[PDB]
């Protein structure tokens, strides 16, 4: 049996494959080693992963997660080693490489993540050969859920979208300006708060201000990130909730900027299953 | 004697006026009642204001500071009353009112602050009648020192401005990306860190991409804040370090958007002195 994980901001998605079949699909909390200690990760595995596994024993583990850079790989691997009995290999790498394997397989492409955060890289068919550091929801992460949320809230409360959308938004999420400021500046994981109010955009996509905010945000991600790669030579592939929920707009953004899209999918898990059983 | 104060994020600027003459000039830390307790404020005053005064007796005190919303007015007043011996009025109001009195006196006008943060309002000649909530360095505060810094760092690290400026910046400030990320996302007062590195812009304003970052930041401020008021009728006055150090580009931004500018000054102290000496002199 093999265990596969893609760990993002809000969640870790796990699949168990055996004899090329899916025999388990599991959500846990996100497991980013910058935000939690090994002890916390190990306890989270024990609490919420193990109860949905049919064994502690795996041939292979492939764990892909935000924040799993070379510095942090050993730490994560030792947690996985301590919790599971792995006979052969324990791969730990980034969510970016998950998306690349999922979307490109063994051939090159430009690969982007558009979820709570965003990211972009060039995958040479084996590994990530180049990348644009995302920089997070304040400084960067163009086109991300948290950035979309940031932009939306700023425009709403600044009376740039009119009174209808502003009041609809505040009433829908039962927010006040004061609540929002508190959340965004003085409460943990503002990026997750902002990404969680971002679905308003998809719900209201037919309104001009809403369409423009998304289109402009996407064009910004493309010009600032994807266009640093050789985008006239390679397809650009997109993985994540935002790539999927705003697919038509992403395609409009790509056509406006000259980018050639490949795969646009919700998450890398479907790709990885194909990757590991073919 | 009268005591005047303008409290901002980085510092509180104090003046002592004696019969229209400036006889004392003092900096302390900023005294935003949302960021410190009344006890912490009182101690800061005893530790840093009182030793710079040769007297604590005043006829009037006018304290203007960020965070001094009506709800916090008596909290602040009582802190000052404790420390200072005052015979007439202790007025406590917002830094926005300081800027307004400083630039407008008794006349109406659009009043803007551009420092570490930014803010805009319509002053009717007596008080702030309307305001655009600035929203902080993440959501808004367009054209502020914090947002200029945010724009600069994102552009530099995302290779938008070339290697030269990128290297020059990291070198000058002894920074590395992972260090910046730490300061911006995981450490206290990221806005102050971002404002603190924004001077790089003034220093390199001859660079076309730096000039352009600042122009577009400023245009964003004007379109998103100032233009919600009756800008085709009233002058927009600008008070702050950013207004001052980037005056020419602010003037350029205003010409481009159709805003008629009024006062552009470093800080409101010069204005408040005139205010209290002339146009609003107690007789």
């Amino acid at each position: 049996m093999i265990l596969i994980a893609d760990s993002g901001s809000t969640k870790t998605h796990w699949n168990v494959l055996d004899q090329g079949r899916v025999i388990g699909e599991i959500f846990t909390k996100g497991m980013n080693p910058f935000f939690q200690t090994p002890e916390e990760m190990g306890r989270e595995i024990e609490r919420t992963l193990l109860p949905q596994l049919n064994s502690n024993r795996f041939c292979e583990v492939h764990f892909f997660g935000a924040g799993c850079i070379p510095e942090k790989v050993p730490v994560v691997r030792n947690v996985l080693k301590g919790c599971l009995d792995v006979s052969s290999l324990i791969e730990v790498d980034t969510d970016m490489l998950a998306a690349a394997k999922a979307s490109c397989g063994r051939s090159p492409g430009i690969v982007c993540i558009m979820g709570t955060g965003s990211n972009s890289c060039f995958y040479d068919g084996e590994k990530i050969a180049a990348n644009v550091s995302p920089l997070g929801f304040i400084l960067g992460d163009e086109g991300s859920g948290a950035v979309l949320g940031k932009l939306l809230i700023g425009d709403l409360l600044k009376n740039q979208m009119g009174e209808e959308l502003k009041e609809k938004f505040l009433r829908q999420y039962e927010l006040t300006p004061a609540n929002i400021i508190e959340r965004v500046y003085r409460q943990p994981f503002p990026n997750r708060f902002l990404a969680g109010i971002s679905p308003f955009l998809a719900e209201n996509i037919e309104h001009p201000a809403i369409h423009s905010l998304v289109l402009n945000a996407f064009k910004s991600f493309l010009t600032r990130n994807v266009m640093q790669f050789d985008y006239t030579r390679y397809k650009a592939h997109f993985i994540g909730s935002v790539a999927y929920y705003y697919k038509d707009i992403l395609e409009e953004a790509a056509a406006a900027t000259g980018i050639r899209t490949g795969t646009i999918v919700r998450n890398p898990m479907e790709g990885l299953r194909t990757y590991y059983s073919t």
Side-chain angles (χ1 to χ4, degrees), chain A residues 2-205 207-278:
Chain A
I2 87 168
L3 177 55
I4 293 172
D6 177 69
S7 186
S9 181
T10 55
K11 194 166 37 44
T12 313
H13 195 164
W14 305 76
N15 280 192
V16 181
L17 308 186
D18 185 57
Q19 312 184 69
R21 258 89 96 235
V22 187
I23 63 161
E25 34 194 350
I26 306 150
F27 286 140
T28 61
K29 287 194 190 171
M31 279 163 185
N32 186 323
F34 279 98
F35 296 109
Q36 69 177 2
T37 79
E39 188 198 287
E40 283 160 348
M41 171 181 195
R43 283 202 278 72
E44 208 56 51
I45 278 159
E46 290 185 2
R47 187 190 177 69
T48 68
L49 183 67
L50 299 199
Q52 289 213 105
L53 292 189
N54 268 114
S55 192
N56 61 311
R57 290 187 302 245
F58 292 83
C59 180
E60 305 183 352
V61 171
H62 309 268
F63 183 102
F64 299 105
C68 288
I69 58 167
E71 181 202 296
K72 285 297 182 202
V73 160
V75 162
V76 167
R77 181 194 303 118
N78 285 353
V79 167
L80 293 173
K81 214 168 184 196
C83 289
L84 307 158
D85 191 7
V86 189
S87 56
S88 307
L89 76 97
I90 306 167
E91 177 179 21
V92 174
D93 217 299
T94 65
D95 54 340
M96 187 83 259
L97 180 67
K101 291 171 186 282
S103 68
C104 294
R106 284 193 154 195
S107 36
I110 303 151
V111 178
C112 313
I113 283 167
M114 293 172 92
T116 302
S118 69
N119 207 344
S120 67
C121 70
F122 172 70
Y123 174 75
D124 65 13
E126 290 188 3
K127 61 182 182 298
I128 301 163
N131 85 105
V132 174
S133 296
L135 308 185
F137 77 100
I138 301 179
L139 295 176
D141 286 12
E142 293 85 15
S144 65
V147 166
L148 288 177
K150 177 181 70 176
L151 296 165
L152 174 58
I153 286 173
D155 286 327
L156 283 177
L157 295 182
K158 223 81 171 204
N159 308 314
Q160 299 293 298
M161 277 188 172
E163 272 277 5
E164 185 66 45
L165 282 173
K166 171 193 194 185
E167 285 308 313
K168 182 187 187 192
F169 176 93
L170 294 173
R171 285 196 305 158
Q172 190 171 309
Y173 295 114
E174 286 150 286
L175 287 171
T176 70
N179 290 352
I180 292 166
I181 294 312
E182 181 73 356
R183 288 304 311 247
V184 162
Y185 293 96
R186 279 178 285 287
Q187 292 290 350
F189 302 104
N191 58 311
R192 296 179 184 169
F193 169 67
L194 288 168
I197 56 76
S198 78
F200 193 81
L201 296 173
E203 286 162 0
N204 293 289
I205 197 53
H207 296 298
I210 297 296
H211 178 259
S212 306
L213 178 166
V214 178
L215 179 59
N216 291 316
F218 285 2
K219 284 175 162 183
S220 190
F221 176 69
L222 297 183
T223 51
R224 293 168 69 79
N225 304 262
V226 173
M227 283 183 85
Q228 296 195 51
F229 309 111
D230 192 358
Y231 72 93
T232 63
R233 203 158 264 113
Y234 300 96
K235 289 171 172 171
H237 302 261
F238 303 84
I239 296 79
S241 62
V242 168
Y244 162 91
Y245 286 120
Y246 302 95
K247 178 181 180 283
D248 290 355
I249 313 301
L250 174 55
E251 282 178 339
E252 179 188 354
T257 56
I259 285 170
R260 182 164 94 283
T261 63
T263 291
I264 307 160
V265 286
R266 204 261 95 171
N267 67 53
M269 299 306 306
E270 166 52 6
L272 289 175
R273 268 180 263 128
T274 296
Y275 185 86
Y276 287 113
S277 45
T278 292

